[model samples]
Target: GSSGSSGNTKQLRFEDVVNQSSPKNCTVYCGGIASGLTDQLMRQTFSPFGQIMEIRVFPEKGYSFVRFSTHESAAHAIVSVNGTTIEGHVVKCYWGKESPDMTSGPSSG
Candidate 1:
């Protein structure tokens, strides 16, 4: 990488900072996941918490967003899946904040 960030450090989303002040909702940011990770992999890993509204994985960025139908499920996902690993890569999960800027959809190549 030309930016010199070095060794796959996670990028900061605007939502992450907002997450600190916003209400806990049915959305989360998952980072440091396997670059090859897929939608099915995300769904299977997170669906157990509850009905998932969406799972948007950015393969190139090695990150994703998991949105549930309700905050209750989101809370559960935070407890259950945060700090967990998928395909042997540890992921960082963050509770999402409500914001217009946080509305990016799934990435596809």
Candidate 2:
């Protein structure tokens, strides 16, 4: 559900929406990210099963989203990393929906 956010003024009001009841917008709490934790690492860890189409890490929100090339891969990632806390903070993996506005023009710089 990548619906764009609604703007009341100059700023856009962001909203997370997941369509098809899929784990599209679930929030993931990834902590203890290795010094070299990069989107490539995520792709490598998930691509093995199938393919990782996208991996977005939001440090400001202390969260991330790992979109798999397939539904099966997504489930696999959750099972493989859920409650398995790596490094220090236990990463909570879930299926979250993304704001449809993601496809729209950029709002935040």
Output the number of the lDDT-best candidate.
1
Candidate 1's C-alpha lDDT? 0.70
Candidate 2 overall lDDT versus native: 0.54
By summed lDDT, the worst window of 10 consecutive residues in model 1 runs over 13-22
lDDT per residue for candidate 2 within 1-109, as digits (tens), equals 5788766643111222223245443333333454435676556655574566667766556566676655555565565576555445566666665558647566765
lDDT of 1 by residue, 30-100 (tens): 78776557888778877786788877889888898888776666666665566677778888777755557
RMSD of 2: 13.4
After superposition, the stretches of candidate 2 with alpha carbons farther than 4 Å from their true spots are 1-20, 23-37, 100-109
